[PDB]
Each structure stands twice: as structure tokens, then as C-alpha cells.
Motif scaffolding. Structure first.
Motif, mmCIF file in Angstrom:
data_model
loop_
_atom_site.group_PDB
_atom_site.id
_atom_site.type_symbol
_atom_site.label_atom_id
_atom_site.label_comp_id
_atom_site.label_asym_id
_atom_site.label_seq_id
_atom_site.Cartn_x
_atom_site.Cartn_y
_atom_site.Cartn_z
ATOM 1 N N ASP A 29 0.840 -1.185 0.000
ATOM 2 C CA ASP A 29 0.000 0.000 0.000
ATOM 3 C C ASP A 29 0.884 1.248 0.000
ATOM 4 O O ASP A 29 0.507 2.282 -0.549
ATOM 5 N N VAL A 30 2.047 1.110 0.622
ATOM 6 C CA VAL A 30 2.989 2.213 0.701
ATOM 7 C C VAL A 30 3.551 2.499 -0.693
ATOM 8 O O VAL A 30 3.174 3.483 -1.328
ATOM 9 N N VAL A 31 4.443 1.621 -1.128
ATOM 10 C CA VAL A 31 5.061 1.767 -2.435
ATOM 11 C C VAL A 31 3.968 1.919 -3.496
ATOM 12 O O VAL A 31 4.038 2.810 -4.341
ATOM 13 N N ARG A 32 2.985 1.034 -3.418
ATOM 14 C CA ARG A 32 1.880 1.058 -4.361
ATOM 15 C C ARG A 32 1.388 2.493 -4.564
ATOM 16 O O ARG A 32 1.354 2.988 -5.690
ATOM 17 N N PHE A 33 1.016 3.120 -3.458
ATOM 18 C CA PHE A 33 0.527 4.488 -3.501
ATOM 19 C C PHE A 33 1.500 5.394 -4.258
ATOM 20 O O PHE A 33 1.097 6.128 -5.160
ATOM 21 N N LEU A 34 2.762 5.315 -3.862
ATOM 22 C CA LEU A 34 3.796 6.119 -4.492
ATOM 23 C C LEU A 34 3.800 5.849 -5.998
ATOM 24 O O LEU A 34 3.754 6.780 -6.800
ATOM 25 N N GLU A 35 3.855 4.569 -6.337
ATOM 26 C CA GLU A 35 3.866 4.164 -7.732
ATOM 27 C C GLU A 35 2.635 4.715 -8.454
ATOM 28 O O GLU A 35 2.755 5.327 -9.514
ATOM 29 N N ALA A 36 1.480 4.479 -7.851
ATOM 30 C CA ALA A 36 0.228 4.943 -8.423
ATOM 31 C C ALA A 36 0.208 6.473 -8.423
ATOM 32 O O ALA A 36 -0.528 7.089 -9.192
ATOM 33 N N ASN A 37 1.028 7.044 -7.551
ATOM 34 C CA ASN A 37 1.114 8.489 -7.441
ATOM 35 C C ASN A 37 2.372 8.977 -8.163
ATOM 36 O O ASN A 37 2.719 10.155 -8.084
ATOM 37 N N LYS A 38 3.020 8.047 -8.848
ATOM 38 C CA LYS A 38 4.231 8.368 -9.584
ATOM 39 C C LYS A 38 5.192 9.128 -8.668
ATOM 40 O O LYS A 38 5.826 10.094 -9.091
ATOM 41 N N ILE A 39 5.271 8.663 -7.429
ATOM 42 C CA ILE A 39 6.144 9.286 -6.449
ATOM 43 C C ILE A 39 7.484 8.548 -6.423
ATOM 44 O O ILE A 39 7.529 7.330 -6.589
ATOM 45 N N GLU A 40 8.543 9.316 -6.213
ATOM 46 C CA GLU A 40 9.880 8.749 -6.163
ATOM 47 C C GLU A 40 10.132 8.103 -4.799
ATOM 48 O O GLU A 40 9.776 8.666 -3.766
ATOM 49 N N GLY A 84 7.674 7.816 9.070
ATOM 50 C CA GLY A 84 6.692 7.148 9.907
ATOM 51 C C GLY A 84 6.311 5.785 9.325
ATOM 52 O O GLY A 84 6.348 5.592 8.111
ATOM 53 N N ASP A 85 5.955 4.874 10.219
ATOM 54 C CA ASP A 85 5.569 3.535 9.810
ATOM 55 C C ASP A 85 4.227 3.598 9.077
ATOM 56 O O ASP A 85 3.667 4.676 8.892
ATOM 57 N N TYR A 86 3.752 2.426 8.680
ATOM 58 C CA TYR A 86 2.487 2.334 7.971
ATOM 59 C C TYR A 86 1.393 3.121 8.697
ATOM 60 O O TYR A 86 0.520 3.710 8.060
ATOM 61 N N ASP A 87 1.475 3.106 10.019
ATOM 62 C CA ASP A 87 0.504 3.811 10.837
ATOM 63 C C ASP A 87 0.465 5.282 10.422
ATOM 64 O O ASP A 87 -0.606 5.831 10.168
ATOM 65 N N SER A 88 1.646 5.880 10.364
ATOM 66 C CA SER A 88 1.759 7.277 9.982
ATOM 67 C C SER A 88 1.172 7.488 8.585
ATOM 68 O O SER A 88 0.226 8.256 8.415
ATOM 69 N N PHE A 89 1.758 6.793 7.621
ATOM 70 C CA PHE A 89 1.306 6.894 6.244
ATOM 71 C C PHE A 89 -0.221 6.827 6.163
ATOM 72 O O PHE A 89 -0.862 7.759 5.678
ATOM 73 N N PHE A 90 -0.759 5.716 6.644
ATOM 74 C CA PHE A 90 -2.197 5.515 6.632
ATOM 75 C C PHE A 90 -2.923 6.710 7.253
ATOM 76 O O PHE A 90 -3.857 7.249 6.661
ATOM 77 N N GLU A 91 -2.467 7.089 8.438
ATOM 78 C CA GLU A 91 -3.061 8.210 9.145
ATOM 79 C C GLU A 91 -2.995 9.475 8.286
ATOM 80 O O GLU A 91 -3.693 10.451 8.557
ATOM 81 N N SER A 92 -2.150 9.417 7.268
ATOM 82 C CA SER A 92 -1.983 10.545 6.368
ATOM 83 C C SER A 92 -2.884 10.375 5.143
ATOM 84 O O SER A 92 -3.549 11.320 4.722
ATOM 85 N N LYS A 93 -2.877 9.164 4.606
ATOM 86 C CA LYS A 93 -3.685 8.858 3.439
ATOM 87 C C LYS A 93 -5.103 9.393 3.651
ATOM 88 O O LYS A 93 -5.709 9.938 2.730
ATOM 89 N N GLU A 94 -5.590 9.219 4.871
ATOM 90 C CA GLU A 94 -6.924 9.677 5.216
ATOM 91 C C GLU A 94 -7.039 11.189 5.003
ATOM 92 O O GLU A 94 -8.102 11.689 4.641
ATOM 93 N N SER A 95 -5.928 11.872 5.238
ATOM 94 C CA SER A 95 -5.891 13.315 5.076
ATOM 95 C C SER A 95 -5.232 13.676 3.744
ATOM 96 O O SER A 95 -5.126 14.852 3.397
#
Length: 111
Positions: A29-40, A84-95
Motif C-alpha cells: 500500500d505504501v510503495v503502491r501508492f507512491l507508484e500509483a502516485n508516480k512518487i519517487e 513514519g511507519d504504515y501507521d503514519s502513512f495511513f493516518e496521512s492517506k486519510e488526510s
């Protein structure tokens, strides 16, 4: 004010060999998001490179330590700053701050 600029890389630590598949998904979900977001970014296989992992364990407080015990992935790391760990990321994805969460919003660069 000091010239030069290489670029950024959301070093995402992953332990191909951790045990908890759940963690794996998180790593995705992490990398995926980046990839899907074309993030480096980069998948720092902490499993393969012990050091990588050890380092993380040195860049992770107990208050952040997930579940219990040593810190487990994913463990996003922008350069040398503890994202931040997945917790952070996720807590961010929501925002939808994943970008800012990693530090992808501070000065000219993107475009």
C-alpha cells in the motif's frame, strides 16, 4: 545559499522476510501508492541488508515502535529523517498528506 540538488527518495524499508504478511501488505500500500502516485522512492530491503534494518532500529523510538518490541516495517524514511511507519502513512492517506508526510512539499522541485 549552497548550490546543488540531487533529488529526493522516499526510502521505504521492507523486510521481504518478516513473518507477518500483514506487514507485507502495508509495505505494498505504501510503495503502491507512491507508484500509483508516480512518487519517487525506494524499497530498502532491510531483510536482505541487515544494516539497513539495524539502522532503522536506531531511527525508531519506543513510542513509535509498532505492535511490540523491535520496530517492524514498513518504515518510510525520507533521506535520513524518520517519516513514519504504515501507521503514519495511513493516518496521512486519510488526510491525503502522504506527500507532506514524506516531505514532498517544501520548496521548488516537483513539476
Amino acid at each position: 545559499g549552497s548550490s546543488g540538488s540531487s533529488g529526493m527518495v522516499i526510502r521505504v524499508f521492507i523486510a521481504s522476510s518478516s513473518g507477518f504478511v500483514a506487514i507485507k501488505k502495508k509495505q505494498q500500500d505504501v510503495v503502491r501508492f507512491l507508484e500509483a502516485n508516480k512518487i519517487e522512492f525506494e524499497e530498502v530491503d532491510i531483510t536482505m541488508s541487515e544494516e539497513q534494518r539495524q539502522w532503522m532500529y536506531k531511527n525508531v523510538p519506543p513510542e513509535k515502535k509498532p505492535t511490540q518490541g523491535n520496530p517492524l516495517p514498513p518504515q518510510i524514511f525520507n533521506g535520513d529523517r524518520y517519516c513514519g511507519d504504515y501507521d503514519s502513512f495511513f493516518e496521512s492517506k486519510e488526510s491525503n498528506t502522504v506527500f507532506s508526510f514524506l516531505g514532498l512539499k517544501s520548496g521548488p522541485s516537483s513539476g
